[PDB]
Scaffold this motif. Structure first.
Motif, PDB file in Angstrom:
ATOM      1  N   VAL A   9      13.154   6.773   9.025  1.00  0.00           N
ATOM      2  CA  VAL A   9      11.901   6.025   9.028  1.00  0.00           C
ATOM      3  C   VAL A   9      11.969   4.743   8.184  1.00  0.00           C
ATOM      4  O   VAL A   9      12.207   4.791   6.966  1.00  0.00           O
ATOM      5  CB  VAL A   9      10.724   6.907   8.559  1.00  0.00           C
ATOM      6  CG1 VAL A   9       9.541   6.052   8.129  1.00  0.00           C
ATOM      7  CG2 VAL A   9      10.324   7.865   9.664  1.00  0.00           C
ATOM      8  N   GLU A  10      11.749   3.608   8.851  1.00  0.00           N
ATOM      9  CA  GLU A  10      11.853   2.288   8.240  1.00  0.00           C
ATOM     10  C   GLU A  10      10.500   1.603   8.144  1.00  0.00           C
ATOM     11  O   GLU A  10       9.642   1.729   9.042  1.00  0.00           O
ATOM     12  CB  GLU A  10      12.766   1.371   9.071  1.00  0.00           C
ATOM     13  CG  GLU A  10      14.075   1.981   9.549  1.00  0.00           C
ATOM     14  CD  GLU A  10      15.117   2.103   8.452  1.00  0.00           C
ATOM     15  OE1 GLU A  10      14.784   1.889   7.257  1.00  0.00           O
ATOM     16  OE2 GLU A  10      16.281   2.420   8.791  1.00  0.00           O
ATOM     17  N   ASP A  13       7.847   0.607  10.919  1.00  0.00           N
ATOM     18  CA  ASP A  13       7.802   1.565  12.030  1.00  0.00           C
ATOM     19  C   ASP A  13       6.370   1.940  12.430  1.00  0.00           C
ATOM     20  O   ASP A  13       5.497   2.137  11.572  1.00  0.00           O
ATOM     21  CB  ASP A  13       8.589   2.835  11.688  1.00  0.00           C
ATOM     22  CG  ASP A  13      10.072   2.663  11.906  1.00  0.00           C
ATOM     23  OD1 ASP A  13      10.863   3.497  11.394  1.00  0.00           O
ATOM     24  OD2 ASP A  13      10.430   1.681  12.598  1.00  0.00           O
ATOM     25  N   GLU A  14       6.131   2.069  13.730  1.00  0.00           N
ATOM     26  CA  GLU A  14       4.791   2.430  14.193  1.00  0.00           C
ATOM     27  C   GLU A  14       4.716   3.789  14.871  1.00  0.00           C
ATOM     28  O   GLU A  14       5.727   4.341  15.313  1.00  0.00           O
ATOM     29  CB  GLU A  14       4.213   1.354  15.110  1.00  0.00           C
ATOM     30  CG  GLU A  14       4.099  -0.003  14.426  1.00  0.00           C
ATOM     31  CD  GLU A  14       3.457  -1.058  15.322  1.00  0.00           C
ATOM     32  OE1 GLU A  14       3.183  -0.745  16.499  1.00  0.00           O
ATOM     33  OE2 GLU A  14       3.228  -2.191  14.849  1.00  0.00           O
ATOM     34  N   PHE A  15       3.500   4.322  14.944  1.00  0.00           N
ATOM     35  CA  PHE A  15       3.281   5.639  15.513  1.00  0.00           C
ATOM     36  C   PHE A  15       1.915   5.687  16.110  1.00  0.00           C
ATOM     37  O   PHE A  15       1.024   4.957  15.698  1.00  0.00           O
ATOM     38  CB  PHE A  15       3.397   6.712  14.431  1.00  0.00           C
ATOM     39  CG  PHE A  15       4.576   6.520  13.537  1.00  0.00           C
ATOM     40  CD1 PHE A  15       5.832   6.999  13.908  1.00  0.00           C
ATOM     41  CD2 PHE A  15       4.446   5.829  12.357  1.00  0.00           C
ATOM     42  CE1 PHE A  15       6.925   6.815  13.096  1.00  0.00           C
ATOM     43  CE2 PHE A  15       5.543   5.635  11.540  1.00  0.00           C
ATOM     44  CZ  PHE A  15       6.789   6.127  11.915  1.00  0.00           C
ATOM     45  N   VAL A 108       1.212   2.506  10.879  1.00  0.00           N
ATOM     46  CA  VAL A 108       2.393   1.768  10.507  1.00  0.00           C
ATOM     47  C   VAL A 108       2.794   2.183   9.128  1.00  0.00           C
ATOM     48  O   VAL A 108       1.969   2.291   8.240  1.00  0.00           O
ATOM     49  CB  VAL A 108       2.154   0.245  10.544  1.00  0.00           C
ATOM     50  CG1 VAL A 108       1.213  -0.163   9.441  1.00  0.00           C
ATOM     51  CG2 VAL A 108       3.485  -0.498  10.415  1.00  0.00           C
ATOM     52  N   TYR A 109       4.073   2.464   8.970  1.00  0.00           N
ATOM     53  CA  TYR A 109       4.613   2.861   7.694  1.00  0.00           C
ATOM     54  C   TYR A 109       4.735   1.582   6.889  1.00  0.00           C
ATOM     55  O   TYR A 109       5.419   0.653   7.296  1.00  0.00           O
ATOM     56  CB  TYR A 109       5.981   3.528   7.895  1.00  0.00           C
ATOM     57  CG  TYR A 109       6.751   3.724   6.606  1.00  0.00           C
ATOM     58  CD1 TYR A 109       6.152   4.311   5.496  1.00  0.00           C
ATOM     59  CD2 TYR A 109       8.082   3.329   6.497  1.00  0.00           C
ATOM     60  CE1 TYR A 109       6.851   4.495   4.314  1.00  0.00           C
ATOM     61  CE2 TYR A 109       8.785   3.515   5.316  1.00  0.00           C
ATOM     62  CZ  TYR A 109       8.163   4.091   4.235  1.00  0.00           C
ATOM     63  OH  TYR A 109       8.854   4.273   3.066  1.00  0.00           O
TER      64      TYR A 109
END
Ligand SMILES: [Cl-]
Lengths: 145, 140
Positions: A9-10, A13-15, A108-109
Motif C-alpha cells: 500500500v502506497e 492509493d485509492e479504494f 485515499v491513503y
DNA sequence: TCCACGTCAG
DNA sequence: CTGACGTGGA
C-alpha cells in the motif's frame, strides 16, 4: 494488526470501500473512524476522515481530527477511552498513524502522521468534544487537492 | 440490472462479501434479501437471517421480508416482486450464505407463494422456488 | 451484546 | 430520508 507503512500500500492509493482497508490491513473497523491496539496501553494505528465529523483538512501537512462519540440519539460528552484514548497515548508513543481520507474512488491513503497534541472543546450545546492535531511526517510523496 | 445468468459468474462461485454480489451485478442491495426491477424478482440471498428452508434438494422455501421476523408482512417491494415472478416465470438468481461467505447457487423459478399466520398472529409470506433443472451441482 | 467517519436502492 | 438477511472489533 501492524503499525506504520503497510506492504503493498502506497501513498496516493485509492479504494472504493471501507472493507478493502480492512482486507489489505490498512484500517480494520468497518465503520468506526479510529483503529488501535494494545502495546498494555492503547496506541492508535489508523484513522479515516471522510466527512462524518467536523474535521479540518487544510490541504496542508496538519489535520485536525475530531474525537468519536458524544453524538457529534441525544448530545453527550465525548469520552477519553477506546479510540480517543488510543490517539492520545499516541501523542507520547510518537508512533506513526495511517491516515485515510474520503474523497468526493472513495478513499485515499494519505500516508503517515503523528499526533502532536489534543485538547477539549465546550461545544455549541455544552458537551465535550476532543480534537487531535496530527502532523504529517515530512518527506513523504505528495497528493493533489 | 440484468435477469438470468451473469457473464463471468458460474454456479458454485464463492464470495466473501455482499458488496461483491453488487460489484459483479449478481445482487444489488447491500443488506436486503431481495433484488428486483420494473415488479419482477431478479435475485435473492438466503443466509440465515430468516426461517428459510434449504432441503439440500432442488426446492427452497424463502421467507418474505419485513414484519420483524411484530407486524404483518406486506406484499410490496421485494415480496411483490417475487410474487409477480410467479407469473412472469422469469429466472431468479439464488445466493446462499455459508458457514468464503456466499455461494451462487444458480437459477430458480417461483412456483408459488402463500401466507402463514405466525406464532403471534401476524402475517409472513413463503415463496416456493424450484431450481431450474439441468445446472451443475452444488455439494453440501 | 453493542456500537460505528457503512452502503444501496427505493 | 430511511429501511435492509451488513461487518468488524471491543
Ligand atoms: Cl468489499
Amino acid at each position: 494488526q501492524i503499525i506504520g507503512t503497510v506492504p503493498g500500500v502506497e501513498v496516493g492509493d485509492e479504494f472504493q470501500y471501507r472493507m478493502e482497508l480492512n482486507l489489505l490491513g490498512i484500517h480494520r473497523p468497518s465503520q468506526s473512524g479510529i483503529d488501535y491496539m494494545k502495546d498494555g496501553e492503547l496506541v492508535a494505528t489508523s484513522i479515516v476522515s471522510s466527512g462524518g465529523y467536523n474535521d479540518v483538512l487544510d490541504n496542508s501537512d496538519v489535520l485536525i481530527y475530531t474525537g468519536q462519540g458524544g453524538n457529534v440519539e441525544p448530545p453527550k460528552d465525548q469520552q477519553l477511552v477506546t479510540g480517543n484514548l488510543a490517539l492520545k497515548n499516541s501523542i507520547n508513543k510518537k508512533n506513526p498513524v495511517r491516515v485515510i481520507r474520503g474523497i468526493k474512488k472513495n478513499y485515499v491513503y494519505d500516508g503517515l502522521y503523528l499526533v502532536e497534541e489534543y485538547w477539549e472543546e465546550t461545544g455549541s450545546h455544552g458537551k465535550l468534544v476532543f480534537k487531535f492535531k496530527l502532523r504529517r511526517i515530512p518527506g513523504q510523496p505528495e497528493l493533489p487537492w
